mmCIF file of C-alpha atoms and ligand atoms in Angstrom:
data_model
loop_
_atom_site.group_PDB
_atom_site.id
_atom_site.type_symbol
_atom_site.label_atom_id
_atom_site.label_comp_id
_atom_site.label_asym_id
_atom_site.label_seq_id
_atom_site.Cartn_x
_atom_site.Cartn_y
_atom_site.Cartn_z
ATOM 1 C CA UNK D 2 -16.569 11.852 6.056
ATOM 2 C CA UNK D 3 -13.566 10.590 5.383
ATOM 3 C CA UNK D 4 -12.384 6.828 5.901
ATOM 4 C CA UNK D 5 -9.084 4.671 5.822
ATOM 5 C CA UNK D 6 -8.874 1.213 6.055
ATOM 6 C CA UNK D 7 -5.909 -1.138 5.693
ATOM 7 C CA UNK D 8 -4.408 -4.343 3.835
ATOM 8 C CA UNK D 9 -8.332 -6.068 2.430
ATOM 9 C CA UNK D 10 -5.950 -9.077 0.903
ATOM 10 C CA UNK D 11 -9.594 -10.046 -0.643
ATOM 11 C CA UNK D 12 -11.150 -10.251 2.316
ATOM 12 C CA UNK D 13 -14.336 -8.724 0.218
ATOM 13 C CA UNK D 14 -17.241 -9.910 3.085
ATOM 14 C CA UNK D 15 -15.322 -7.710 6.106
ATOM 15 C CA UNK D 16 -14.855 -4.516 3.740
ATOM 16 C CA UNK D 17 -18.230 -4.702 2.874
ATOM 17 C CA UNK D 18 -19.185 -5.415 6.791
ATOM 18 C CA UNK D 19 -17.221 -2.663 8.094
ATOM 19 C CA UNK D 20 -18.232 0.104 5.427
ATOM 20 C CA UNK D 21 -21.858 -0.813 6.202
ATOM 21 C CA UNK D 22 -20.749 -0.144 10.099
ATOM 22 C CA UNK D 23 -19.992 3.179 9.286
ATOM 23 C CA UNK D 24 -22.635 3.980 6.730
ATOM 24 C CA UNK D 25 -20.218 4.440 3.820
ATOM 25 C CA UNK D 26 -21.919 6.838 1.065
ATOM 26 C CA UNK D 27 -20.587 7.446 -2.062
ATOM 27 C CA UNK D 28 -20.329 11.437 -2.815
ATOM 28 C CA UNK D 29 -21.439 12.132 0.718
ATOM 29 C CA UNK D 30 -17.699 9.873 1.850
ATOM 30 C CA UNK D 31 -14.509 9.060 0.405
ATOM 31 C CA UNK D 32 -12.605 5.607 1.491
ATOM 32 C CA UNK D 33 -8.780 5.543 1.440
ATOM 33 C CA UNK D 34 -7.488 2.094 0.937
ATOM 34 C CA UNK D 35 -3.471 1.133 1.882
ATOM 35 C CA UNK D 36 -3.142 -1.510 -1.117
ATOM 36 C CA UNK D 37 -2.723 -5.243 -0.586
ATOM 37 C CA UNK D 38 -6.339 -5.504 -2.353
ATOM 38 C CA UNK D 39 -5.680 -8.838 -3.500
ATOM 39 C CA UNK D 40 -4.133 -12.317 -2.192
ATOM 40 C CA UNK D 41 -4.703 -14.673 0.081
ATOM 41 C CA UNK D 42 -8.232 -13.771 0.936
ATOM 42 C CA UNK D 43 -10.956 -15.271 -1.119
ATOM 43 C CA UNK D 44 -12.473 -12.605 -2.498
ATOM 44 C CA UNK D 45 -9.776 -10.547 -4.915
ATOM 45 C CA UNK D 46 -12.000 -10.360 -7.560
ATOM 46 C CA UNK D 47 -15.031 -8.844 -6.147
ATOM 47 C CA UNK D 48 -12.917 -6.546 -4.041
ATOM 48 C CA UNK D 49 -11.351 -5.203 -7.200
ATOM 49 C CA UNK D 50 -14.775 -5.083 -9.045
ATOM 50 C CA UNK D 51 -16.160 -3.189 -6.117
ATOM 51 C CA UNK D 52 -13.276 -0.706 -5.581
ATOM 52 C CA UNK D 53 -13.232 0.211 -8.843
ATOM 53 C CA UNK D 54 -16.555 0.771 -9.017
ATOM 54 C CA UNK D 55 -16.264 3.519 -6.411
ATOM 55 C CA UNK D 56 -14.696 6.053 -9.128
ATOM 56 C CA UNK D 57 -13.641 9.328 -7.655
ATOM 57 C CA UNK D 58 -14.975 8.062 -3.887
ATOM 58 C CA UNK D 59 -12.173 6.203 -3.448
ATOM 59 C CA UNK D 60 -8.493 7.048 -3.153
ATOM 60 C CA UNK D 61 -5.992 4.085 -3.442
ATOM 61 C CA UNK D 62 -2.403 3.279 -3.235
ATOM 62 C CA UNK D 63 -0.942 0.119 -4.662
ATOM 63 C CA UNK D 64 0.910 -2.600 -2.774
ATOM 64 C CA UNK D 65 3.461 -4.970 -3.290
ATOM 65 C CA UNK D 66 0.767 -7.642 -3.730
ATOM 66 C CA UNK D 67 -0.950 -5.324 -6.045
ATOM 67 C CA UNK D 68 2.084 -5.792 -8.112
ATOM 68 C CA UNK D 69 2.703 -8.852 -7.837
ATOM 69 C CA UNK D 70 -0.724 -9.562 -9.556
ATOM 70 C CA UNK D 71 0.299 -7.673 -12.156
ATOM 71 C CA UNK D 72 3.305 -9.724 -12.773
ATOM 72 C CA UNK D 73 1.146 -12.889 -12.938
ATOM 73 C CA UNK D 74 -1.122 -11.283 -15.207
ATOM 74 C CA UNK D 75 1.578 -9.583 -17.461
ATOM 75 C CA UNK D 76 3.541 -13.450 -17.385
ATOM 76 C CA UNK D 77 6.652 -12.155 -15.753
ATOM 77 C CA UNK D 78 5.910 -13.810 -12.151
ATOM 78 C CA UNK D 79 4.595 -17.320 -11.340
ATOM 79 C CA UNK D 80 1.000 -18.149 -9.878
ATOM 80 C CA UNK D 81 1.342 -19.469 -6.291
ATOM 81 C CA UNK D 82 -1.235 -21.371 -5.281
ATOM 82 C CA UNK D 83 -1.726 -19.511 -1.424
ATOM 83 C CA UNK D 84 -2.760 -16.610 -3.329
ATOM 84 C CA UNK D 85 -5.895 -17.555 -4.524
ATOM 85 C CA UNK D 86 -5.739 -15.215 -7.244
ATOM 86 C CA UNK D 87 -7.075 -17.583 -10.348
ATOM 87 C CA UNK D 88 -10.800 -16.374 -10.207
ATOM 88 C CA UNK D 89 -9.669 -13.265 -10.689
ATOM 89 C CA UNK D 90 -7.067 -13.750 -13.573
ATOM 90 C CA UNK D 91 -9.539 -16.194 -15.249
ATOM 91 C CA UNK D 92 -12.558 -13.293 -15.172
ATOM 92 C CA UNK D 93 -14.273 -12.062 -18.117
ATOM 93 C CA UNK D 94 -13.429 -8.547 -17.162
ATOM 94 C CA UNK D 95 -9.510 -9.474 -15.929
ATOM 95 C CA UNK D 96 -8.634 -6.859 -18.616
ATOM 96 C CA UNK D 97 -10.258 -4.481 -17.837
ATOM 97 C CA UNK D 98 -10.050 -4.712 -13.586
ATOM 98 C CA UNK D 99 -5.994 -4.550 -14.257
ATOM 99 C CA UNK D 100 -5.583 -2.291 -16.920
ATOM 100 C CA UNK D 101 -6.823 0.279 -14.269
ATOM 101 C CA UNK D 102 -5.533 -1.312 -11.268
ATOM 102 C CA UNK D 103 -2.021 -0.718 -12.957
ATOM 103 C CA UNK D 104 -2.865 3.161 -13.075
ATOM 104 C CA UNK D 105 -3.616 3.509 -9.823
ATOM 105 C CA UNK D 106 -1.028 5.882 -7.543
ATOM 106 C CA UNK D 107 1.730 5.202 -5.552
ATOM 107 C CA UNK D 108 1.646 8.181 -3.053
ATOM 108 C CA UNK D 109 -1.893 9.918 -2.087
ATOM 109 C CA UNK D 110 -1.646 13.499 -0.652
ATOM 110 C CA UNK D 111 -4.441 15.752 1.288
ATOM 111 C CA UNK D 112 -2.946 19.022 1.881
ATOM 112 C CA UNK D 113 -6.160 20.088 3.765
ATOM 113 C CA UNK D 114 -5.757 17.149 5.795
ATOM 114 C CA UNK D 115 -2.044 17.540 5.793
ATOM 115 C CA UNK D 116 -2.298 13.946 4.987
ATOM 116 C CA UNK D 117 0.009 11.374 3.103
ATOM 117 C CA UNK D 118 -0.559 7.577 2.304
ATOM 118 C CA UNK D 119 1.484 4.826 1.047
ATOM 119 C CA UNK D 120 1.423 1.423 1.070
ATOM 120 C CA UNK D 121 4.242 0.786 3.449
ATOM 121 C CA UNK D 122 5.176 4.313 4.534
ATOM 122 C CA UNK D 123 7.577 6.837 3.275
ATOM 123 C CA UNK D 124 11.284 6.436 3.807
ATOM 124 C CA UNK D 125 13.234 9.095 5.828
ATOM 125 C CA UNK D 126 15.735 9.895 3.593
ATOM 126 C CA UNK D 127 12.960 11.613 1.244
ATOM 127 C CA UNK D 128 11.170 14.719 1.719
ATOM 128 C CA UNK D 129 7.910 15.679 -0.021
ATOM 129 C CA UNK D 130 8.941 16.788 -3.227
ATOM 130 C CA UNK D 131 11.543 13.896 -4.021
ATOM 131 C CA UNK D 132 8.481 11.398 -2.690
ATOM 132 C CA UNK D 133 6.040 13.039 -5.522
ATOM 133 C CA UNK D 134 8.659 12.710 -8.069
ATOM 134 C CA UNK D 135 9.586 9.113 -7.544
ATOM 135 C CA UNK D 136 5.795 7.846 -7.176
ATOM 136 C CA UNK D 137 5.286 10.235 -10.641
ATOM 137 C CA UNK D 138 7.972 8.022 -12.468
ATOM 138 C CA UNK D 139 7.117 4.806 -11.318
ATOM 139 C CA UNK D 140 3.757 5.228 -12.008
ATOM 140 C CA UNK D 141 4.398 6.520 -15.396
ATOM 141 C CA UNK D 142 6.420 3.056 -16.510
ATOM 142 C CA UNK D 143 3.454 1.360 -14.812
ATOM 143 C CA UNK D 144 0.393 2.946 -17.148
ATOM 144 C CA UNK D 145 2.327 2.871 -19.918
ATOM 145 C CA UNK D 146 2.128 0.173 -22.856
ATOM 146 C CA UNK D 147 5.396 -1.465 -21.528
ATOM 147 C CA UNK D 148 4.385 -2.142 -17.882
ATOM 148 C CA UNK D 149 5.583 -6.087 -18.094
ATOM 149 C CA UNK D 150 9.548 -4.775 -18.979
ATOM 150 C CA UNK D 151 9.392 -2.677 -15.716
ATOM 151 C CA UNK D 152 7.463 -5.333 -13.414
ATOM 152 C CA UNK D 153 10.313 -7.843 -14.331
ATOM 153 C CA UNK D 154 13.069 -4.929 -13.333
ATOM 154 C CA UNK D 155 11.157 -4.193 -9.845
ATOM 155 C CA UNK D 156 12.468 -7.490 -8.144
ATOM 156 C CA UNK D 157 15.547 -7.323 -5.967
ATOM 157 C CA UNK D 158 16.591 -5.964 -2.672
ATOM 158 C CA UNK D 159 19.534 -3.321 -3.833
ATOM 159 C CA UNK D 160 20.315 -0.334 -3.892
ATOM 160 C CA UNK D 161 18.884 0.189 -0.165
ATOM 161 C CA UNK D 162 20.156 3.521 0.047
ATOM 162 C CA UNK D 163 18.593 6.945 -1.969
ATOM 163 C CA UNK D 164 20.236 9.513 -3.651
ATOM 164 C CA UNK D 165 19.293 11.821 -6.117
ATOM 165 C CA UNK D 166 22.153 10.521 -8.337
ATOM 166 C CA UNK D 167 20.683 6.950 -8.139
ATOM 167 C CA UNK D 168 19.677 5.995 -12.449
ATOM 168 C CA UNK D 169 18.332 3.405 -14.480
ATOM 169 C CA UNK D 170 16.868 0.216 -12.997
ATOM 170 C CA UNK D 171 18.662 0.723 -9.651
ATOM 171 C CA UNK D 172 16.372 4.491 -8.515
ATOM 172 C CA UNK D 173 13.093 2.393 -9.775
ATOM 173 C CA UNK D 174 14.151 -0.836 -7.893
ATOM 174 C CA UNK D 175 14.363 1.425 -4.400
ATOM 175 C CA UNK D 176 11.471 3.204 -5.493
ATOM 176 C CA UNK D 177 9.459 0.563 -5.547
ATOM 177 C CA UNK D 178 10.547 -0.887 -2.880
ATOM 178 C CA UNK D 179 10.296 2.286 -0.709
ATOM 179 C CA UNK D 180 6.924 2.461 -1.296
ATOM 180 C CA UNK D 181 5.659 -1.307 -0.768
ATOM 181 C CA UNK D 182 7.939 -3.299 0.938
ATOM 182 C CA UNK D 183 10.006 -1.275 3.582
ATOM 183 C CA UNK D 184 9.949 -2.184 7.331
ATOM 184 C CA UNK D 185 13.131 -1.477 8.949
ATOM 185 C CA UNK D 186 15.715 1.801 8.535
ATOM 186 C CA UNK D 187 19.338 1.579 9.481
ATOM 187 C CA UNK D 188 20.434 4.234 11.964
ATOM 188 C CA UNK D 189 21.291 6.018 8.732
ATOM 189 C CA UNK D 190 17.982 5.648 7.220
ATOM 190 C CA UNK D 191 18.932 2.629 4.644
ATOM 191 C CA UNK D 192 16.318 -0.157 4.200
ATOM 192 C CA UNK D 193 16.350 -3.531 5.197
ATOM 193 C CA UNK D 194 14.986 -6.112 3.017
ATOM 194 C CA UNK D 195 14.741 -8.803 5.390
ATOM 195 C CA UNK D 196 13.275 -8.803 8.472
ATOM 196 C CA UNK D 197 9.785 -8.712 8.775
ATOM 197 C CA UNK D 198 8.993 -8.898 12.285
ATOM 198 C CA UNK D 199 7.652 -6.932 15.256
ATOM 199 C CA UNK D 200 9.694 -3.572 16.461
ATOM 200 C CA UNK D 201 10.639 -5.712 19.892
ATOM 201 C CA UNK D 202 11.677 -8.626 18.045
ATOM 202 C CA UNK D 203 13.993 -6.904 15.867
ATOM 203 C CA UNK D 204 17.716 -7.389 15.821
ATOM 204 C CA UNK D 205 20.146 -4.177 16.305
ATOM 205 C CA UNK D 206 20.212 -1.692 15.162
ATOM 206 C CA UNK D 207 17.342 -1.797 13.367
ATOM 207 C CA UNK D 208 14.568 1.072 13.964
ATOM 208 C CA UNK D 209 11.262 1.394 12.143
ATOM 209 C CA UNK D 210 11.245 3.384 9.360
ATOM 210 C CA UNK D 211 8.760 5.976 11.419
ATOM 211 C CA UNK D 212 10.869 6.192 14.738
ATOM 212 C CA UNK D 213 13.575 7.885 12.298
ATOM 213 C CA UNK D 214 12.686 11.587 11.919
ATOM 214 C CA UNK D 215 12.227 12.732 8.070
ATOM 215 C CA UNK D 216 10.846 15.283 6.275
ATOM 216 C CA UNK D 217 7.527 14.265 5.310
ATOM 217 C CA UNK D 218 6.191 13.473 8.855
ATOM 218 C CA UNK D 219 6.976 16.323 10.655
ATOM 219 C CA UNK D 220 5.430 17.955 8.251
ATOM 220 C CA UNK D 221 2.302 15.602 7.449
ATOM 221 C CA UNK D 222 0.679 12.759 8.998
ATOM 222 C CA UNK D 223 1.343 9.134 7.113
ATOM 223 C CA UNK D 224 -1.242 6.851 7.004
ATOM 224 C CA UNK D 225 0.336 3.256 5.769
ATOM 225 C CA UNK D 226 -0.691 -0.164 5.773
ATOM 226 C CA UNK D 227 1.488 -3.556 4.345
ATOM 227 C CA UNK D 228 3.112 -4.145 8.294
ATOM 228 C CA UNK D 229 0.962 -6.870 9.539
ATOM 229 C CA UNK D 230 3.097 -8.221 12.768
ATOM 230 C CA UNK D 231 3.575 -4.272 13.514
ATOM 231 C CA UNK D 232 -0.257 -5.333 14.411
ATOM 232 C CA UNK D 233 -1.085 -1.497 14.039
ATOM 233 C CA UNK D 234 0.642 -0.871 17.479
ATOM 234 C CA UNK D 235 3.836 1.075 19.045
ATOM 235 C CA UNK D 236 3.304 4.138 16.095
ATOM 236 C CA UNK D 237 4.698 7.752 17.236
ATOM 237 C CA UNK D 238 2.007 10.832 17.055
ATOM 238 C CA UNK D 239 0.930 11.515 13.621
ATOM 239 C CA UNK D 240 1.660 7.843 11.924
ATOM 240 C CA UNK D 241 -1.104 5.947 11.197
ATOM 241 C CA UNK D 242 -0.583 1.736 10.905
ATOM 242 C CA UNK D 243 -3.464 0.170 9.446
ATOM 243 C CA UNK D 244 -2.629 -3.381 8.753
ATOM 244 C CA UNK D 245 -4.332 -5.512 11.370
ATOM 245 C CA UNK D 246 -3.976 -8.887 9.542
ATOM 246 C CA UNK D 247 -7.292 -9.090 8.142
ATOM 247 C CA UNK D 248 -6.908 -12.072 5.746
ATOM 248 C CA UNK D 249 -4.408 -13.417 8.882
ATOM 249 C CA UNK D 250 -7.478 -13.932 10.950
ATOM 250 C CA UNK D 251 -6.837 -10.488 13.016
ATOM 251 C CA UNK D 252 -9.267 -7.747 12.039
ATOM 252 C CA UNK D 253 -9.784 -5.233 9.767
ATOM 253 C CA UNK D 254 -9.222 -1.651 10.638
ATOM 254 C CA UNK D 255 -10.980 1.355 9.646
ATOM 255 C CA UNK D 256 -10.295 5.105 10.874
ATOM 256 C CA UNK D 257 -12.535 7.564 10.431
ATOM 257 C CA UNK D 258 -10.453 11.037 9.676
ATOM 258 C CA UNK D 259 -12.614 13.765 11.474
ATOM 259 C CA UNK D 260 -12.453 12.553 14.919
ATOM 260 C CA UNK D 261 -10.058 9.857 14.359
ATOM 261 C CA UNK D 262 -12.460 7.236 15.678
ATOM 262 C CA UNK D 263 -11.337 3.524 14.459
ATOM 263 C CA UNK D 264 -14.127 0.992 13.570
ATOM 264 C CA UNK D 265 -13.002 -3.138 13.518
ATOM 265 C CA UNK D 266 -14.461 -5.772 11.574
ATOM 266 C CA UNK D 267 -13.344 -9.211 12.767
ATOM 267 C CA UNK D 268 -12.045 -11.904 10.470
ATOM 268 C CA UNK D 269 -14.101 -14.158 9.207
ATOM 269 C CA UNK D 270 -11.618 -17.069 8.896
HETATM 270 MN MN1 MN S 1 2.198 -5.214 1.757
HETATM 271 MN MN1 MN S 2 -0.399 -7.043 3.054
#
């Protein structure tokens, strides 16, 4: 079978409930994960431990929190305290958990499943193809030997808008945050970098990135995660929001593919 589950955020004791719900088996199952391992729950470092352990069972995107670990580790971001992340940096085996954390893919694709994940969704103004290409480069800056010169370039909000002209710092600036941090569209499909609220609570004439018709979705189903106050609610046909708030004390959310039967673990907290 074939599971998805949303943002962990370290929250390492309801993963490990909620795969026992469903009688996860390795080689038998495969678990898709939406990023956000790490942060703010207390259990980043046995969640990575674990996920990494699964190998080939499990399929994972990363997140923007998944980066911004990597900045802390690489020295190019700051430790904040809420994040709980110093058991993890200060592990024996912090080399080797991040050294393949930073490998991991942006963009997952089923084409039997006709199935597509990233963290926070995938804009509108890209279609398949240009998606591929853009997780490809970023990922390739992120496994290589000079990850820490590209995790200082990923901060900032601009450019907001794609084209396939976009170069240089600016195309891997809205990559990245096309893929973990985008929300809200513009009518005209440009991000906004600000607002982080519900779809009802959202000034004009702001849309969700989903309720803009693109490419990839009429084409594929998008499972995503990263949205909390979305609350996985108020999704058209075919998109898939599996942030629940987990380490927020809401729940986390597991959907079984097959018969797209969701399983909930309650927060501990
Ligand atoms: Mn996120
Ligand atoms: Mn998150």
């Amino acid at each position: 079978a074939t599971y998805l589950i949303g943002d962990v955020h370290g929250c390492y004791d309801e993963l490990i409930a909620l795969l026992h719900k469903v009688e996860f088996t390795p080689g038998k199952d495969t678990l898709w994960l939406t990023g956000d391992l790490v942060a703010r729950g207390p259990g980043s470092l046995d969640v990575l431990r674990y996920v990494k352990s699964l190998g080939d069972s499990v399929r994972l995107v990363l997140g923007n929190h998944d980066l911004h670990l990597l900045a802390v580790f690489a020295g190019i971001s700051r430790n904040k305290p809420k994040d709980r992340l110093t058991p993890l940096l200060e592990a024996p085996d912090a080399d080797e958990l991040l050294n393949w954390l930073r490998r991991q893919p942006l963009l997952q694709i089923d084409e039997e499943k006709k199935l597509v994940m990233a963290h926070a969704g995938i804009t509108p103004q890209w279609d398949l193809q240009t998606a591929k290409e853009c997780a490809r480069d970023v990922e390739a800056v992120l496994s290589s030997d000079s990850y820490p010169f590209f995790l200082d370039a990923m901060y900032g909000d601009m450019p907001n808008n794609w084209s396939p002209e976009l170069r240089g710092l600016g195309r891997l600036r809205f990559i990245t945050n096309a893929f973990t941090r985008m929300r809200f569209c513009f009518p005209n499909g440009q991000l906004d970098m600000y607002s982080k609220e519900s779809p009802e609570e959202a000034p004009a004439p702001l849309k969700p990135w989903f309720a803009i018709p693109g490419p990839v979705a009429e084409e594929y189903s998008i499972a995503f995660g990263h949205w909390a106050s979305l609350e996985g609610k108020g999704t058209p046909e075919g998109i898939y929001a599996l942030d629940t708030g987990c380490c927020w004390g809401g729940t986390l959310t597991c959907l079984r593919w097959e018969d797209k039967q969701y399983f909930v673990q309650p927060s501990n907290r």
